[PDB]
Coordinates of C-alpha atoms and ligand atoms in Angstrom, one line a residue:
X104 CA 15.8 -208.9 -99.3
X105 CA 18.3 -210.1 -96.7
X106 CA 15.6 -212.6 -96.0
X107 CA 15.6 -213.6 -99.7
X108 CA 19.3 -214.2 -99.9
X109 CA 19.2 -216.1 -96.6
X110 CA 16.3 -218.2 -98.0
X111 CA 18.2 -218.9 -101.2
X112 CA 21.4 -219.9 -99.5
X113 CA 19.6 -222.1 -97.0
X114 CA 17.7 -223.8 -99.8
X115 CA 21.0 -224.6 -101.7
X116 CA 23.0 -225.7 -98.7
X117 CA 20.2 -228.0 -97.5
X118 CA 20.5 -229.8 -100.8
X119 CA 24.3 -230.3 -100.9
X120 CA 26.0 -233.6 -100.3
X121 CA 29.0 -232.2 -98.5
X122 CA 26.9 -230.3 -96.0
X123 CA 24.5 -233.1 -95.1
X124 CA 25.8 -233.4 -91.5
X125 CA 25.4 -229.7 -90.6
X126 CA 23.5 -228.9 -87.4
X127 CA 21.1 -226.0 -87.5
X128 CA 23.7 -223.7 -85.8
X129 CA 26.5 -224.8 -88.1
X130 CA 24.2 -224.2 -91.1
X131 CA 23.3 -220.7 -89.8
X132 CA 27.0 -219.8 -89.4
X133 CA 27.8 -221.0 -92.9
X134 CA 24.9 -219.1 -94.5
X135 CA 26.1 -215.9 -92.7
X136 CA 29.8 -216.4 -93.3
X137 CA 30.3 -217.5 -96.9
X138 CA 31.3 -215.2 -99.6
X139 CA 31.7 -215.8 -103.4
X140 CA 34.1 -215.0 -106.1
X141 CA 34.5 -215.7 -109.9
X142 CA 37.7 -216.8 -111.6
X143 CA 38.9 -216.6 -115.2
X144 CA 40.4 -219.6 -117.1
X145 CA 44.0 -220.2 -115.9
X146 CA 43.6 -218.4 -112.6
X147 CA 45.6 -219.9 -109.7
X148 CA 43.0 -220.0 -106.9
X149 CA 45.5 -221.6 -104.6
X150 CA 49.3 -221.9 -105.0
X151 CA 51.2 -224.8 -103.5
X152 CA 53.5 -223.7 -100.7
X153 CA 51.6 -220.7 -99.6
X154 CA 49.8 -220.1 -96.3
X155 CA 46.1 -220.7 -96.6
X156 CA 43.2 -219.2 -94.7
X157 CA 40.1 -220.2 -96.8
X158 CA 38.0 -223.4 -97.5
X159 CA 36.4 -223.4 -101.0
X160 CA 33.3 -225.0 -102.5
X161 CA 32.8 -225.1 -106.3
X162 CA 29.4 -223.8 -107.4
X163 CA 30.2 -223.5 -111.1
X164 CA 32.8 -224.8 -113.5
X165 CA 35.8 -227.0 -113.0
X166 CA 39.3 -226.7 -111.4
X167 CA 42.5 -228.7 -111.8
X168 CA 44.6 -229.9 -108.9
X169 CA 48.4 -229.9 -109.7
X170 CA 51.2 -230.8 -107.4
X171 CA 54.9 -230.8 -108.3
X172 CA 54.0 -230.5 -112.0
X173 CA 51.7 -233.6 -111.8
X174 CA 48.0 -233.3 -112.5
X175 CA 46.2 -235.0 -109.7
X176 CA 42.5 -234.6 -110.5
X177 CA 39.7 -232.4 -111.8
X178 CA 37.0 -231.1 -109.4
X179 CA 33.6 -230.0 -110.3
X180 CA 30.3 -228.5 -109.0
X181 CA 29.6 -229.1 -105.3
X182 CA 33.1 -230.4 -104.7
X183 CA 35.3 -228.7 -102.0
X184 CA 39.0 -228.0 -101.8
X185 CA 41.5 -226.2 -99.6
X186 CA 40.9 -228.2 -96.5
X187 CA 44.3 -229.7 -95.9
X188 CA 46.1 -226.5 -95.0
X189 CA 43.4 -225.5 -92.5
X190 CA 43.1 -229.0 -90.9
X191 CA 46.8 -229.4 -90.4
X192 CA 48.1 -225.9 -90.1
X193 CA 50.4 -226.4 -93.1
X194 CA 51.2 -224.6 -96.3
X195 CA 49.0 -225.4 -99.4
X196 CA 50.0 -228.9 -100.6
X197 CA 49.0 -228.4 -104.2
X198 CA 47.9 -225.7 -106.6
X199 CA 44.3 -225.3 -107.7
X200 CA 43.7 -223.8 -111.1
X201 CA 40.5 -222.7 -112.7
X202 CA 40.0 -224.7 -115.9
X203 CA 37.4 -222.5 -117.6
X204 CA 36.1 -218.9 -117.4
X205 CA 33.3 -218.1 -114.9
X206 CA 34.3 -220.6 -112.3
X207 CA 32.5 -219.6 -109.2
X208 CA 33.5 -220.7 -105.7
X209 CA 31.9 -220.1 -102.3
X210 CA 34.5 -219.8 -99.5
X211 CA 34.7 -219.4 -95.7
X212 CA 37.7 -218.7 -93.4
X213 CA 39.5 -221.1 -91.1
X214 CA 37.5 -220.2 -88.0
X215 CA 34.2 -221.0 -89.8
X216 CA 35.6 -224.1 -91.5
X217 CA 36.7 -225.6 -88.2
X218 CA 33.3 -224.8 -86.6
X219 CA 31.1 -226.3 -89.4
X220 CA 32.9 -229.6 -89.9
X221 CA 32.7 -230.6 -86.3
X222 CA 30.7 -233.8 -86.2
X223 CA 30.7 -236.5 -88.9
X224 CA 32.0 -234.2 -91.6
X225 CA 35.5 -234.0 -90.1
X226 CA 35.9 -237.8 -90.2
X227 CA 34.8 -237.9 -93.8
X228 CA 37.3 -235.2 -94.8
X229 CA 40.2 -237.1 -93.1
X230 CA 39.2 -240.4 -94.7
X231 CA 39.2 -238.9 -98.2
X232 CA 42.6 -237.4 -97.6
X233 CA 44.0 -240.8 -96.5
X234 CA 42.6 -242.5 -99.6
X235 CA 43.8 -239.7 -101.9
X236 CA 47.4 -239.9 -100.5
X237 CA 47.4 -243.6 -100.9
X238 CA 46.4 -243.6 -104.6
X239 CA 48.8 -240.7 -105.4
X240 CA 51.6 -242.6 -103.7
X241 CA 50.9 -245.8 -105.7
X242 CA 50.3 -243.8 -109.0
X243 CA 53.7 -242.3 -108.7
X244 CA 55.4 -245.8 -108.5
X245 CA 54.7 -246.1 -112.2
Ligands
PCG600 N1 47.9 -232.8 -101.5 C1 46.7 -233.1 -102.3 N2 45.6 -232.1 -102.4 C2 44.5 -232.3 -103.1 C3 44.3 -233.6 -103.8 N3 43.0 -233.6 -104.5 C4 42.5 -232.2 -104.4 N4 43.3 -231.5 -103.4 C5 43.0 -230.2 -103.0 O1 44.1 -229.3 -103.4 C6 44.4 -228.5 -102.2 C7 45.7 -227.8 -102.0 O2 45.5 -226.8 -100.8 P1 45.3 -227.6 -99.5 O3 46.7 -228.5 -99.3 O4 45.0 -226.7 -98.4 O5 44.1 -228.7 -99.8 C8 44.2 -229.4 -101.0 C9 42.9 -230.2 -101.4 O6 41.7 -229.8 -100.9 C10 45.4 -234.6 -103.6 O7 45.2 -235.9 -104.3 N5 46.5 -234.4 -102.9

């Protein structure tokens, strides 16, 4: 029963692109720590400017990223968000809005997030942030 849920969560995580660098211990912590929630269409999962404590992974549906009234992108299944506030100890840099009903996210707190990214995952997260900031900066020149 608990073994079933462990089995299922391990099976899914082992398949996921973003978690491909997890050590066995990091994977164990993630399986034990994550929780899930469902959002309705239009729900603000994250609001820009607020303190954040959670890292999110989309398991169903799509979300919109909006910053200063500008749409930045749409994220989908097996994408993550909410990493910037936790990495840099800063308020949320953008809002994240559920685009449809029944969007489901997994999430872990900051302590778990910091522990499970150690290794190659950290460097990949920071690289993506750099590229994102670069394109947004150039996009805004128009
Ligand atoms: N500032 C910013 N955040 C983004 C972008 N794309 C998706 N996001 C996510 O939106 C989130 C806002 O909360 P965080 O700042 O903690 O982390 C952010 C990211 O994970 C982007 O191009 N710029």
